[PDB]
Amino acid sequence: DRSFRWKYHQFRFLCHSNALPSHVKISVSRQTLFEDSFQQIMNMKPYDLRRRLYIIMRGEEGLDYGGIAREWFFLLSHEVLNPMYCLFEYAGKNNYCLQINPASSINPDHLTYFRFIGRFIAMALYHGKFIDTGFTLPFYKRMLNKRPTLKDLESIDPEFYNSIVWIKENEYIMLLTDWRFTRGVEEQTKAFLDGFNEVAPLEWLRYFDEKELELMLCGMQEIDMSDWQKSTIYRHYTKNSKQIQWFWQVVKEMDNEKRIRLLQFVTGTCRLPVGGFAELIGSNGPQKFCIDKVGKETWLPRSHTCFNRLDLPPYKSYEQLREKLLYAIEETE
């Protein structure tokens, strides 16, 4: 229940208490980056990856190894997304909802590559480096031994979610829910978790929730309040409605961390799209941040991350809306 700041410091300090001296060299070329990094890292002992990193980009004069490290992490974290490797894929249009490719077994040695990716992510977390791989929140759930829920089903598979939501309301459901997330990607996921656990114990993530973990891996960015409010559309509501005015009031009241938490709550990620909120992506294509008048005032506001939509009840007071919004943002998904 402690703040994200506290968990961050505790995790970093925990990493530092288990720090090893000396260093390790990783020699790669920026056009054989994937295979070279793979070979280098997988030919090393896991704990040795806790030593200070010196990425050797063959043919470059730079001596700022921190920047070289960061650039390497970014480049590789993007390189693992190459559809030629059949390691990852997307469940929706416009690179929406990254997931492990069930057909990854088309390459017989794929599990070693997933273990390598685990090691890699573990290295990024250990050395305080950021990645832009774009793992979804349920993925992080799996990393935190949290089971994916029905809401998550709405996040990654809206039609499946609608079907199930109908079946119900007019045990099976639970098996279906688990199956949608775990189908064809069992061994790959376990290999990833093992590779991660080789370098940095999963146990060290025990205090984080999924959004906080995503924040740990992606890094914090300041949110343009202006760009956000400009790209916001409304249903039934107008920008002059009481609830909307109060809403933006609350958002401006928020610090950056809280705004990020809101962004994660409504969109499903802390990452901003290229070109600002105007280029916001949901399932079924481009979809800007929307606010809808849905739900009773006795209910919390709720989100549809597939549509980047915020169901906001017509609360009769600013304080009520503020309370419910903060609570829903911090305690519900």
Side-chain angles (χ1 to χ4, degrees):
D1 295 299
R2 297 267 217 142
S3 65
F4 171 77
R5 183 180 179 271
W6 179 89
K7 303 184 180 188
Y8 176 85
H9 288 107
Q10 162 278 324
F11 181 75
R12 297 277 75 229
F13 296 163
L14 185 52
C15 294
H16 297 346
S17 67
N18 289 270
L20 292 179
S22 179
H23 78 284
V24 286
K25 302 184 183 65
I26 299 181
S27 305
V28 301
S29 295
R30 66 193 319 113
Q31 250 290 101
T32 48
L33 164 68
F34 182 74
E35 265 307 311
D36 289 344
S37 300
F38 175 78
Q39 185 274 337
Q40 290 281 283
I41 291 182
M42 293 305 294
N43 200 26
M44 278 186 289
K45 308 166 188 177
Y47 284 2
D48 284 340
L49 296 174
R50 299 184 184 181
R51 308 179 182 273
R52 284 172 175 82
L53 297 179
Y54 279 85
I55 280 75
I56 311 303
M57 307 292 301
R58 292 174 295 180
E60 317 190 331
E61 62 180 300
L63 296 185
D64 177 26
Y65 281 97
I68 298 165
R70 291 168 222 152
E71 182 186 1
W72 173 76
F73 275 105
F74 278 133
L75 287 173
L76 189 50
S77 69
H78 272 200
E79 246 305 285
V80 298
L81 302 184
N82 196 340
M84 252 182 166
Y85 302 143
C86 299
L87 299 177
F88 296 95
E89 65 177 16
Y90 297 101
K93 306 184 179 84
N94 307 129
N95 291 10
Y96 186 78
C97 275
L98 179 81
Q99 61 180 18
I100 295 182
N101 196 331
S104 64
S105 56
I106 193 175
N107 299 120
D109 199 41
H110 61 133
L111 293 185
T112 307
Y113 283 90
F114 282 102
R115 188 158 61 90
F116 157 70
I117 294 173
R119 282 191 173 188
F120 170 74
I121 303 301
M123 289 173 61
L125 253 180
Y126 188 88
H127 297 282
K129 305 295 182 177
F130 299 147
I131 59 158
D132 198 36
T133 308
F135 295 115
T136 66
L137 293 180
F139 188 88
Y140 296 118
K141 292 202 170 184
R142 178 53 185 272
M143 286 182 60
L144 305 167
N145 284 92
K146 297 190 63 178
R147 232 117 70 147
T149 64
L150 201 53
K151 181 85 194 302
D152 304 328
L153 253 190
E154 187 182 30
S155 289
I156 82 168
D157 207 328
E159 87 199 348
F160 198 92
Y161 174 81
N162 289 337
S163 160
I164 284 195
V165 155
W166 182 89
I167 292 185
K168 257 175 57 179
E169 138 206 341
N170 291 269
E171 158 168 327
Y172 178 68
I173 305 155
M174 296 301 294
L175 290 316
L176 260 197
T177 298
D178 177 85
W179 185 79
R180 175 57 187 87
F181 289 100
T182 60
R183 59 189 195 179
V185 295
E186 335 85 357
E187 298 180 44
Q188 301 90 322
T189 298
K190 159 172 223 175
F192 171 84
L193 292 177
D194 292 337
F196 189 101
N197 197 83
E198 283 171 21
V199 176
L202 294 160
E203 338 204 341
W204 293 2
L205 308 175
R206 104 188 294 271
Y207 293 147
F208 290 104
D209 61 54
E210 335 87 47
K211 305 183 176 179
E212 290 178 325
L213 182 55
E214 185 194 23
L215 205 52
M216 291 287 300
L217 270 175
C218 301
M220 285 185 300
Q221 284 180 90
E222 256 281 331
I223 294 181
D224 195 329
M225 244 285 298
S226 312
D227 183 37
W228 195 351
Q229 189 165 0
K230 293 181 313 184
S231 311
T232 295
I233 60 182
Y234 306 96
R235 288 173 37 144
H236 306 94
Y237 277 145
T238 60
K239 57 174 176 296
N240 299 125
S241 304
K242 297 178 179 178
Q243 290 75 15
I244 300 305
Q245 296 282 320
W246 291 338
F247 176 79
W248 293 115
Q249 221 173 125
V250 175
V251 182
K252 166 100 179 37
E253 174 195 348
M254 292 181 180
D255 54 12
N256 191 68
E257 269 183 31
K258 206 64 61 182
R259 298 178 183 178
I260 289 182
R261 185 80 175 192
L262 172 58
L263 179 65
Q264 291 177 308
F265 179 77
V266 186
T267 70
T269 177
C270 59
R271 313 178 313 272
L272 280 313
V274 169
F277 288 85
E279 311 299 330
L280 199 54
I281 295 296
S283 61
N284 308 320
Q287 196 135 29
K288 303 180 284 194
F289 185 89
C290 173
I291 308 184
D292 197 347
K293 187 201 295 181
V294 171
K296 321 178 176 302
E297 58 174 342
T298 64
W299 298 353
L300 296 178
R302 73 156 290 186
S303 63
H304 302 270
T305 67
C306 54
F307 304 138
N308 304 320
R309 180 184 300 165
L310 183 67
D311 294 336
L312 183 69
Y315 298 114
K316 291 234 245 171
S317 151
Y318 159 83
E319 259 318 334
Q320 176 186 32
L321 186 144
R322 179 188 167 277
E323 246 184 3
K324 289 228 172 60
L325 185 61
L326 290 178
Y327 177 83
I329 256 57
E330 204 61 35
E331 290 295 324
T332 72
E333 66 185 1

